[PDB]
Design a protein around this ligand. Structure first.
Ligand code: NA
Length: 151
């Protein structure tokens, strides 16, 4: 398409490998019609305020993938410093150490890991970031309540 044939091949193969052998806690649900839009679920890790939740999310392979990371959104509502009001996952965090040799597997691991260790210094959710830093117990409680409803 607007993606080079070698990127198409590499994406399709990497998505197949993710269907068969995903990171623990992660499942992928490829769309046969749009290679560029990938639905994913991530289990809220134990030992975090997201424990027990199943978080639906999607990746959109934009203009400049793999020069830039895919765009990520949580579809499951969440109270997390790095997730904005439309469910967008902070681009600046996803871009840390990004190079074009990275792919979908790294993006999904980075998101899963972000549930365990948020980065409130790059807060899209200003209140989440503030509470995490100033009153963690209240951050955790808000996040646990939302996880009970939405996860
Ligand atoms: Na962090």
């Amino acid at each position: 398409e607007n993606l080079p044939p070698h990127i198409i091949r590499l994406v399709y193969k990497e998505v197949t490998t993710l269907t068969a052998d995903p990171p623990d806690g992660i499942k992928v649900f490829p769309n046969e019609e749009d290679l560029t839009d990938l639905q994913v679920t991530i289990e809220g890790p134990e030992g975090t305020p997201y424990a027990g939740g199943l978080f639906r999310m999607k990746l959109l392979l934009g203009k400049d993938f793999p020069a830039s990371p895919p765009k990520g959104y949580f579809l499951t509502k969440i109270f997390h410093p790095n997730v904005g009001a439309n469910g967008e996952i902070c681009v600046n965090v996803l871009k840390r150490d990004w190079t074009a040799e990275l792919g979908i597997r790294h993006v999904l691991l980075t998101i899963k890991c972000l549930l365990i260790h948020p980065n409130p210094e790059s807060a899209l959710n200003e209140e989440a970031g503030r509470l995490l830093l100033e009153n963690y117990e209240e951050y955790a409680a808000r996040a646990r309540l939302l996880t009970e409803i939405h996860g």
